[PDB]
Amino acid sequence: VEPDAGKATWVAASTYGTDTTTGEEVKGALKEIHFSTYKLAAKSFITDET
Amino acid sequence: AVNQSSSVEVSSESYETIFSQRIIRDLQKELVVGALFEELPMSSKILTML
Secondary structure (H helix, E strand, O other): OOOOOOOOOOOOOOOOOOOOOOOOOOOOOOOOOOOOOOOOOOOOOOOOOO | OOOOOOOOOOOOOOOOOOOOOOOOOOOOOOOOHHHOOOOOOOOOOOOOOO
8 A cells, every 4th residue: 555745845946957856755665454364163063862 | 851952052941742642541440240130121110010
């Protein structure tokens, strides 16, 4: 599962040259979410007399 | 008792069992004084003879 924002830092416009800041954001970070399974079980019996 | 098992299967109390419609009887004493002597027919109330 992905993450969102993502904050781009505005630049006052004194300079030219590129000369571009970018808020130093992680290019590819993701989150694993993992699932697990439980088991319900029962037993019954029948005696050889009833 | 009748209510068996009780861990764990479904078992009832009484009135599960099959009933029978035949009637039995013990060997009664033989009938002999009521079926030995001779009958005399009559037609009134008292009979007289000489």
